[PDB]
RNA sequence: GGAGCUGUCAACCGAGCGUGGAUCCGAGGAUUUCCGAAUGGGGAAACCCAGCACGAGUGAUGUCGUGCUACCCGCAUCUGAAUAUAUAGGGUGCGGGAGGGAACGCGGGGAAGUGAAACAUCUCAGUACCCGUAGGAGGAGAAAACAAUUGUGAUUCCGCAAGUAGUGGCGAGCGAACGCGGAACAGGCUAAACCGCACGCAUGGGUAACCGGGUAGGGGUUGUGUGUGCGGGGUUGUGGG
RNA sequence: UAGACGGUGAGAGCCCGGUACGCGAAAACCCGGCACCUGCCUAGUAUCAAUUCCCGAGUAGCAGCGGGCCCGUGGAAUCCGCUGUGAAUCCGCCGGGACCACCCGGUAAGCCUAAAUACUCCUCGAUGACCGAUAGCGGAUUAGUACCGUGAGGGAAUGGU
RNA sequence: GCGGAGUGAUCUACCCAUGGCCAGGGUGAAGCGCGGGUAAGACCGCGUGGAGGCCCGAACCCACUUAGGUUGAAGACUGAGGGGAUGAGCUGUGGGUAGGGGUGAAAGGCCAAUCAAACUCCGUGAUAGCUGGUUCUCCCCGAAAUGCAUUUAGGUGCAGC
RNA sequence: CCGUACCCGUGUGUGGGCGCCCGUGACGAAUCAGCGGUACUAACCACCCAAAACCGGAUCGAUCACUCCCCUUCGGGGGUG
RNA sequence: UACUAAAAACACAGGUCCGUGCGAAGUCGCAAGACGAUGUAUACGGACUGACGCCUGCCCGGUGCUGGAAGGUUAAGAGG
RNA sequence: UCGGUACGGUUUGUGUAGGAUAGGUGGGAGACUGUGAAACCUCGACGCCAGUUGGGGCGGAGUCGUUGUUGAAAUACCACUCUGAUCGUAUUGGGCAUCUAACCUCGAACCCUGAAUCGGGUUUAGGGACAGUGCCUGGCGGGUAGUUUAACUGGGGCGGU
RNA sequence: GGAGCUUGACUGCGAGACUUACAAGUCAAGCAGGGACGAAAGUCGGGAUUAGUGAUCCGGCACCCCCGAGUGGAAGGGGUG
């Protein structure tokens, strides 16, 4: 699943590369850090 | 925890343990209870939700 | 309505009323102590003891009469901590529920004795019982239905199908629907799409390609998306928007 | 239109209350009757290639364990639960008793929906090849009484000048 | 007897909180001082002391023998002798633990006069191959107690009669 | 009830004392120049805590090739190294 | 052992053994939560024994319980 | 790291055929002149100065089919070599880890609780991907639960049938 | 007792009777197929006879256009052994 960051990390990278996230890693790690988005209507806004 | 869900109303299940010489006896299922802790938004103070998991991947999604 | 009446066991003494309409009968109102969900707090239910506010009373407290004061959830409003955001909570003001009733309903849990000539699967039985929850009925219900070629066309209920097919330590037993005959016969709203306003993040820090739609100007202008809030739109299987 | 029934000193259509039938009402509740208030549509319905989007998601499916169904997991579909994994949007999914191909039926993961159905605490009306005081309600008689038990509970008897 | 739901710690078992009570004598521990003994202290003799799950023995608590009771005065008692009696004592009040559970200095004892699972209402009119009972008359006919099988031998199915 | 009391509160009057109040007294707070206790801390260290790759000092069996000799039943036993 | 048994039974103080390192182990509930204990290995739980004196001989095979990786077997899962 | 599997590459055994000992090979009988140079000490997964395949470089113009006297050997062009060592783009079971951010804390402080050793929130310290818990699961289990534990018979039992 | 050659140690059957509580058991002339032995007649559907075995339900292994849950299949069932 790709999604959309906020800052580069050695897991998920750029801001709109491709993500591959670990199913968990993202909304205990990720989300509370304000850095990534499961993706709703995100990949336009992307754009 | 043997718990409910809060958001899914989810709850137990009864049923039978049905040994190999069919002595069915009463087991229950239950939910796959988490204690989340749920902030409302980024900034909260993330209570306590006992969430089961089909409730932590997909509907309800804090932590 | 019309001549008595003063409920009765239980008929005794009183002392009264009634033809100006009594007792009596119907409907509506007022009063409706105390307990009881009982709810101001407490309590060996039917009692103990209060707060505030009106309103009496005494020379003055004590006393008395009336009203509210439980809790919870929902909402409106100020609020908002540790900590700033902000919630958690915290006042305020209306709205609600609680508890019962013989059964009938739906959802969940769910025995045992018994039968099986023992017994464990199975029965008994989804029975008794237990919990949740409403109703005048409930539930179910409008095809992701059966049917198998002629198909029917929501559900529910009654008679058959049928003790049938089956299913059963194929034991004791359990047992449909297809389908017909009938009671009755009712179908609808939504979300999803998109179009429209609004807030808040992204976007423009504007040249944005868009201003009800067509050409030429035209302020250079918020064109353009997002997390939702609301208004239309849409409701279908001969597929439909 | 009255010979229902019951009473009166016996067995009453004609003595009485009544019945048959007819009147019957303020107010209440309720049936319902008309006007007011509110609720729409200021055509895209048609036909059109089909350029595109949508048609209910941790749901359906699949695997694990159970429930339920005539179906005792058997080979079992359909449906329901809990756990993993986990989809599409019509050239999609679903069903047609494993499953597969063709052929049919329908479009689940929103909700709502009267009737016929059962029910009896309650009031009215009625009846009985129902009982008639040891019966019939436990209860005709102060009845869930007296008494019994700590309590939950049990629980009578008792009519006739 | 089995299950569901309750009711019971007013008796009894244990525990918790707070109170009460135990005549009368006797024995004389630790300790302290004295005369000491002993380089010292151990020990003796003194006085004082007042200790004990100490002694005897009233209340109070039990219940050992025995006679009496035995359709008792009493559903567990009475008379005489008994054990305990400052304690692991008795007792009061109030409270707590509950049925496959409580509590138990343990006996399977007590849990409201019947506890190897209380009591009550319900399943329920359980069920028994076992026992008892089954009510009026006559007329005709009229057996069997054997075979086989049996978780069967006091039942039953079939046959025989 | 009699006699004599005690307690909790209330009303009216009287004495003086106190003190709010103008009137005296106990003191005591402000920013500014000086300086201190060193409390506190952008570096580091006195002491000592503790542990690192990496060189490693004793431990040994139920571990793998050595076979240095044992009986074998195709299988094992001592001991540095 | 109420209500036929008061005893040689039960308890005991003493002795070991086993467990428990601390929201203990054990126990009551499903859980929270309790007691254990506002205790802490000289403490708490369990089992046997039963003041004191002399002592408590032999056996690790059976079964527990205790610690041990050559392994074999090995069920859902992975897998194809 | 053990080690994996798809793979984008340098590309593997002194057994016979010996300049020459390349799982199979092969659109072809060099990828035209268009290759990692037969010059030196050459010493590597083979190490056997022999190597068709060869490690640090060559008289900056030639290991050639068709100078094969061998399976046609000139296959770093078709098999982009089995591709042994793997050279790194992925996947990714185990082995061991360090970390914190889920989650667990009767460890700490504060807040509405000051009416609080319950709660809840915040920071805090510690664990920490463990336990726990859910679904699946092997074992074990008189700890509880339902039940079985036959008959004959010269009473029953023991014996036997 | 021996010697030869062989598989009838058969497929489809069966009038009839023995016995039988029922279930089960036993014999069976003869009929046809296709065989053995015999020159033929004939005998052979196990052993001189009577024991050497177990019902049912349920699974298994093969042959058969028997059925096949919309139809073609199939799984599953079914008959035979």
Redesign the interface.
């Given at each position: 699943m790709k999604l959309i960051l906020t800052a580069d990390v050695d897991h998920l990278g750029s801001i709109g590369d491709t993500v591959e996230v670990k199913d968990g890693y993202g909304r205990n790690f990720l989300l509370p850090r304000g850095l990534a988005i499961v993706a709703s209507r995100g990949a336009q806004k992307q754009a | 925890m043997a718990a409910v869900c809060d958001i899914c109303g989810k709850g137990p299940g009864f049923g039978k343990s049905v040994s190999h010489s069919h002595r069915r006896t009463s087991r229950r299922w239950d939910p796959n209870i988490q204690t989340v802790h749920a902030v409302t938004r980024?900034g909260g103070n993330k209570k306590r939700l006992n969430v089961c998991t089909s409730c932590i991947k997909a509907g309800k999604?804090?932590?």
């Open positions: - | 980024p999604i804090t932590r």
